[PDB]
Design a binder for this molecule. Structure first.
Ligand SMILES: Cc1cn([C@H]2CCCN(Cc3cccc(Oc4ccccc4)c3)C2)c(=O)[nH]c1=O
Ligand SMILES: Cc1cn([C@H]2CCCN(Cc3cccc(Oc4ccccc4)c3)C2)c(=O)[nH]c1=O
Lengths: 191, 191
């Protein structure tokens, strides 16, 4: 059972991962988590963050370049994800491939059917062989405005991916989602 | 003994690697080679080549992005290079870190003391921990002109790196270099 938590609000996404983990562990199922990017454990992830803050020349001026770094991050964790799914009952990922497609398409002002989204699905799932997630849970100066526009675009792209079952079945939940009900819906009792 | 062969002429660089290998094997020393980028064995290297030919969106529009891909290529071969240097007497690399600095600086119209060159030395040797080479042997429509200018710039950057001992001692040789003399100069008899 590989579950990926997506959304634009990271602080709430982290909370949902905590409440969801406690619910699964309360039901007797073992849980293990992993957050992307893997800052401090992957050189590709650290480079991306550093490029964001002006390092590495023009590396940040290419959306696909940054997306590639993120994709390479998960590529190095493939055997780590496979190991967790074999030794644990539930594996919860804080952000996954869907994040790369939603934010990449938003930056390029594209939709779910855009070139950037299809490229993400192609390179990470088909070429890199990243495990397909069983569930993808969507949690619904002047620079302050240039950001809010990217969040709304990313959030809309998220809504498109979930509506079309991008990379697997989805499940849209609000911040007020009940953890017990969500964990019972993702992994019902009696297998 | 880690030896790196550099230069702008790849066809001649490949020949020098062959003649140099035969000379070392004639002296009783065992030899093993490895060429960068590692097309077909590294996903980062293949992505770079594919980006060159129009794939991966704008990934190719960033020099540092491509340089990062090349650097990540060698980063994955670090333990492979260390294994060869332990089981073989001589390890000859067809292109190495110096290539990334010479061509990157040439594309950005920079010199050896430019930002791009220093970045290559910083990220690949200091951060990624790539083994320092004992020797770095330098082999000295309208689009046909836009290329010849890059080769001369790269060749000049090469000349600068070798003159200042960039990343280690260098050795400039022409295509007419004698293989027996070169192998005797890089690894003299009697240790
Ligand atoms: C795991 C993941 C996450 N993200 C976003 C999710 C929201 C937070 N950012 C943080 C971040 C890190 C590094 C660089 C960066 O700025 C960029 C990213 C891409 C292009 C240009 C600048 C943003 C990363 C992606 O875009 N793709 C991913 O694959
Ligand atoms: C091993 C190596 C090699 N090269 C060059 C040595 C001369 C041949 N090219 C071939 C090549 C491959 C992929 C892309 C490419 O075009 C670029 C490269 C960088 C930026 C933009 C386009 C060229 C690679 C580097 O620039 N850095 C390296 O680290």
């Amino acid at each position: 059972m590989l579950i990926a938590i997506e959304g634009v609000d990271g602080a709430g996404k982290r909370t949902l991962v905590e409440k969801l983990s406690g619910a699964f562990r309360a039901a007797g199922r073992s849980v293990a988590t992993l957050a992307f990017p893997r800052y401090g454990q992957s050189v590709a992830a650290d480079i991306a963050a550093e490029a964001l803050h002006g390092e590495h020349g023009d590396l940040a001026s290419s959306v696909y370049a940054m997306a590639t770094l993120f994709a390479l991050d998960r590529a190095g964790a493939v055997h780590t994800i496979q190991g967790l799914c074999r030794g644990y009952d539930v594996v919860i990922l804080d952000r996954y491939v869907a994040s790369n497609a939603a934010y990449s398409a938003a930056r390029l002002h594209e939709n779910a059917a855009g070139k950037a989204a299809a490229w993400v699905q192609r390179i990470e799932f088909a070429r890199l062989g990243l495990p397909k997630p069983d569930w993808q849970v969507l949690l619904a100066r002047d620079n302050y405005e240039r950001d809010a526009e990217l969040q709304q675009r990313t959030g809309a792209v998220y809504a498109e991916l979930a509506a079309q079952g991008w990379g697997g079945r989805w499940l849209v939940v609000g911040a007020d989602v009940d953890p017990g009900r969500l964990a019972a819906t993702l992994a019902p009792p009696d297998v």
